[PDB]
Amino acid sequence: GTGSIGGGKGSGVGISTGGWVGGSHFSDKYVVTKNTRQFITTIQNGHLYKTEAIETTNQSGKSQRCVTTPWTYFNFNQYSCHFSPQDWQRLTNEYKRFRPKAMQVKIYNLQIKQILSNGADTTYNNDLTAGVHIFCDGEHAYPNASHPWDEDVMPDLPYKTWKLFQYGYIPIENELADLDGNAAGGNATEKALLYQMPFFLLENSDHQVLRTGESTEFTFNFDCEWVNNERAYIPPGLMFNPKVPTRRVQYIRQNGSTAASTGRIQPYSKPTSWMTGPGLLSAQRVGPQSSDTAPFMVCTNPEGTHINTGAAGFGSGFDPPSGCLAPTNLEYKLQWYQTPEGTGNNGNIIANPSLSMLRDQLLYKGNQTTYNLVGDIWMFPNQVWDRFPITRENPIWCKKPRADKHTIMDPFDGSIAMDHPPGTIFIKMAKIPVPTASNADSYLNIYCTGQVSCEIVWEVERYATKNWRPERRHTALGMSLGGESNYTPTYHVDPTGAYIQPTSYDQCMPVKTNINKVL
Amino acid sequence: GTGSIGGGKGSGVGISTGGWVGGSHFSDKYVVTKNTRQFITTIQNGHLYKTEAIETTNQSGKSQRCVTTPWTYFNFNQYSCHFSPQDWQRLTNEYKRFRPKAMQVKIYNLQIKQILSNGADTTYNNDLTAGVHIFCDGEHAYPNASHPWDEDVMPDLPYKTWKLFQYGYIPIENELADLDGNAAGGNATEKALLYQMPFFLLENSDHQVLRTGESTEFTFNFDCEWVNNERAYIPPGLMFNPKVPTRRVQYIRQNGSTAASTGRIQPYSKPTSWMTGPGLLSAQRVGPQSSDTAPFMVCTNPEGTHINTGAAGFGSGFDPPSGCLAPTNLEYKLQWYQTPEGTGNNGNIIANPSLSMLRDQLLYKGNQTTYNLVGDIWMFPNQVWDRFPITRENPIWCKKPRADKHTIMDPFDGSIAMDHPPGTIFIKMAKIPVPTASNADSYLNIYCTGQVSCEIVWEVERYATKNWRPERRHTALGMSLGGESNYTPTYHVDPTGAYIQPTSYDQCMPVKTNINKVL
Amino acid sequence: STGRIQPYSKPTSWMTGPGLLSAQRVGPQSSDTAPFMVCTNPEGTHINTGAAGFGSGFDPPSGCLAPTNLEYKLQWYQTPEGTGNNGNIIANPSLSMLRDQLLYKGNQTTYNLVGDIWMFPNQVWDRFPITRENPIWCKKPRADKHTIMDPFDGSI
Amino acid sequence: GFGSGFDPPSGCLAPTNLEYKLQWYQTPEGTGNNGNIIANPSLSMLRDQLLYKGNQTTYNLVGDIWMFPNQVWDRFPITRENPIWCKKPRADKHTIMDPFDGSI
Amino acid sequence: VLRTGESTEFTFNFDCEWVNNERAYIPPGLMFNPKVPTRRVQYIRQNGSTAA
Amino acid sequence: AIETTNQSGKSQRCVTTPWTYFNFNQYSCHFSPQDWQRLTNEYKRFRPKAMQVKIYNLQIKQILSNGADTTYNNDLTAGVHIFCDGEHAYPNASHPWDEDVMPDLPYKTWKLFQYGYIPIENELADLDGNAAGGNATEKALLYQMPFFLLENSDHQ
Amino acid sequence: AMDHPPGTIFIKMAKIPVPTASNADSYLNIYCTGQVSCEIVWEVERYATKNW
């Protein structure tokens, strides 16, 4: 049902630079997702680079220093971006693993409008000679624009308008520069940090400038590890045959009155060579919602401790701490809101056990009498665990920090650590100077709308099982009713046009809950 | 993990004529199922062709006449035969339609044992020179051996032994020959029916005779209509847009005091051109469990009615009558037992609404005041309906009767009417005569065991949908616990080795419940 | 009660073929007596209760059903001089089991003969057995829509 | 709200009342008896058919005539104001498709 | 997506049954010749006083 | 299922199969004490490179038990099913330090052990468990508990 | 620890059905003896030392 486009192959105002793409194609080895959004970008910071310091004192809740830029950026990092709930269901039901392979982004059909405000009404007219600056940072030569679990992501519904967020970054750890700080300290390393605090201008590189008849296109080739969709039906410790005897001997030392005994290990409990995976349960969250509450605080202090007992502005919180361990409290569970309007207990989704036996692991230390839970299990030889089951609402990737030494990279939120994730596309409108009598900068008030199309080829692979029995699958019967009068199902739309969100973790259709693997 | 077979390529005792095949392979266009069973066949009727007449009088419950044969036969007609519950789940979740394409049956690794009974113990020794007669009737030159919903089918679990049933057939409709019948009737057409009553001997054709080192193989190419796995989310009558006005006028005649009115048909109810599919709700079942209780009785009486008000032995019951209509009572619902040991309300599965909108149809006849349900809706122009949703426990095919004229063939049990279904493989052991002093026939008591492997190529086709929302799927979470202590799930095995059956219709995973189609 | 269907009566998927037994013939030999009258009236009914000149008679009505009376049996004369009961041949049951079909509707207590069985899915029947004295063909009417063509007299 | 209405029911039968006749408005502003067009007999003899069941004494009109062997009829005569096509529902089984409004 | 200088075009090939414009001047039941005799016999069962 | 209560000492659930298996995993299997001595005295490292297993000279005997004595006779047409699971598509048959291993002395007879596996962690399904708990994740584990039949694959 | 250790060889005897009057499964009582030969090539490497 594709029409033949008429009109010449030329270019300019009155010729569109691309069409709308949408929908997925499933195959055995590949899944192709196509998504187009209409985006809107506006002037940021009045075309200025600014810095901001909180100066802590708990007013904001810690000490941050940020530089905000005139730029905005595209954030594609999330699965709901690329998959409809239908397509995500099909992916997690029909395939044991998948990874992104190739990516193609087009920015096209650009429209710059001048904003004319007279009194109480505002008008919008084309300025056809206005440009927009666009470039991708693929070298990661600038601070990353996006961080996992941000609300800046592409809209889930294809017909919603995507408003870009302002780009900004933290030039320095602000608590490490207290300025005067303490008087008898004679601050030096604090000034030394400020003198070498970097400053980044996107204007320091080459940009493409697009007028309304131009378009631009970016391609990216993923070299990626697979995200696996498989469930362990047993722990690795149960891989034995309980009827078979073992050669192994268990010596039990003298316990109180009970004499030291030796004997053959029972057939139904055989020793395992495989250990609980890493995780930290010992810490608890601190302080009011306003501060940084994470149970572990990862700080870098070059000088003399004194983290002000509340972590001050030193460091960032490490959450979730528990890793693959069974969370012993709600604090340790990954939790988010479906909507930027979510608050409190409304609109929040708590991650639930996937019922995979490589997750929710625990370690118990025997004394002579009993077993006690080991709070902090560190990285140890012979640990095996599965990754956090990712839903359609999880971030896809995180960027690996550039560093000399790193341990196993398995972010506990479930995002894939990548050496070179897709580059961020930065976009701002050309500053249009307005002639002014004084030296105060005045500009023309303009905004740009356009279409972005993302197209990802997913390398995918199906499952084969010798299991006799029907496996668990994701089904619409696990959905719930919502909206006004509560007659609208989960991924449907409200009578007001509101898109009903999943209220539970299973409605988000996590991976590793369905297809069984033999250990 | 296939080994290299050693020993020469020759043949005889001590060389196996084939290996075990099992398991399925799924693809986009094809599914291959492989099944092997160990079967046992024994002597039937003491090597005789016998006839039997009931002579009705309600003792058996009607008048049947059957000829039983020394032969036994293979019955492959059912889906549980060819698909594990896992593979069936995958078929009905991942594909919108499927059909059988090619079929291959091997009979091999035959063993004939002599049965030696001395006193209270019996011994089994090889007789290596004994044969078994095997032939397929692909021309359907003999009465069909199997009828849909028989218990003679291949065992569901691959490791169960398959005992073949004796072949037999009804040579004549017995009530039509009452012999003396009525005295003043002067029975003639009754004798005329008996004189031309056919008699069939399988010995009238060519057979393959196999000794223990021989094997045999049959192939069949299906030319078949697709069994569709798709759900109508709306009736065909809702295909309109309720906001759009219609040109159509509805004139309502004068009803009592209410004056005759004319006006525009309301936008939210637009007239449809499509009619409820066929079905018969008016009949009820008759009589005790012992008789033939079906609500409709399909009889052929060449002479003078008098069906004895209980249908006598005239005709057979037509069930289920309701077709695609919404069953108004339990009587009209397809119901079976999972086990030949099922009785009463134990072990029975009642078909439930698939929630497809091309099923469960109803027609209401307006009088002036109200609407009343139309009991018997016959075949009518512009009727559309979906086929009965078939589960893994349904028969696959039925044979189309050879007849001059036939209407649309849509068996209400859900089996596919075929002109030439796969031929029945008949097997009996060679009669081994024992020398006897008298003329009374004595034979050597022997039985045969062997392996049958069935291999079907299924032409299959996947679905694509523009639906945004997650569709319903079959999941293990709809299974139930059973067995002793009731800790064993549905398709698992009991502590006693008993195979837990599905207790509900949805655990059988019917088709047309999952993948949506746009009408 | 619920229970296993008895082995000697198994349910069938196949239905009695079409036929109409409910009508009877009308009026004296002089008129058109057929039990069913197939009429086309473009205006205002009033078929004069005797079918008038509206329409033609549909006979035999019974199709493949077992005829319940002499009226439903195909009957002709061998000779143009045949009259009355002289020279007439009545079609008799061929003793084929795809003919002479009947349908019985169960109430709870008993089974009653279904008079009018219409075209229905899964009906199979054989054509009227033709003798040497039957017509061979009839011409299909030129028309937009037609159901299965199986003239009940047996002509092709 | 169960189900949709099936109209016109009469098919190729002679409509016995105004209710059974196809009727529409020429204009979206048509209301009542103003602007309405009632389908009239085309005077084709494959339309306006009737069936009469003889008892012994007389003939009575058969109300519901179902699909039956050896039925022949013409399609509803279509005017310039009729719809051309309708889409066949996707379904496993269907009888003869002859929408009574006359659309293909 | 079309701007003002663009156009688009769709083509479709009907595979269709004919809509027929023809009138039947007689019913199919009148196709006979009323002068010709028929071989067919009509038996009328006994109706009340009227003999079969 | 044990149902724990310390009777066996914990809660296990196992499915036992008609199958038996070969377990080659141990060094005493492959090396005489002499050869092992020579390996550990003369070499700084070693690894297995290629492996070849033959199963041959098969004998199936029928076991005839009459009273207090039992006889053994050949049934020459009897088969044995053999397959290797190299894809590890089924639960592992063997676990390290099992007594199912090949005999150390070459002239000892090797009796195969029955194959079996743990389908689920049994304590995670307590069935009724606690009443106020309203067990769901426990039933959810049982519904998806796998079941493996070796007959689901090809055998020689 | 190996990603793909040698596959397990499974062996059972063919179930030999015995004809029985009831539906209770009876089988022929049989056992199999045979020879298994394992042959492993070991890649091995000798030592050299400057130890006196």
Structure explained in plain terms:
The structure is cut from a larger assembly and holds 7 copies of chain A. Chain A has 519 residues and is mainly beta. Helix content of chain A is 4%, strand content 29%. Chain A is built from 3 helices and 29 strands. In chain A, strands 2, 3, 6, 7, 9, 12, 13 and 28 form an 8-stranded mixed sheet that branches. At the B-C interface, helix 3, strand 17, strand 18 and strand 26 of B face strand 6 and strand 9 of C. Chain G: This is VP2. Chain G: It comes from Primate bocaparvovirus 1 (strain Human bocavirus 1 type 1) (HBoV1). Chain G: It is found in: Virion. Chain G: Belongs to the parvoviridae capsid protein family.
The biggest beta sheet of chain A is recorded as: 8 strands, mixed
Cα shape of chain A: globular
Strand tally of chain A is: 29
Strand content of chain A: 25-35%
Q: What is the helix content of chain A?
A: under 10%
Largest Cβ-defined interface: B-C, 75 and 50 residues
- Rg of chain A over CA atoms, rounded to whole Å, is 28 Å
The SS-based structural class of chain A is mainly beta
Oligomer: part of a larger assembly
- What's the total helix number of chain A? 3
For the termini of chain A, the CA-CA separation is 48 Å
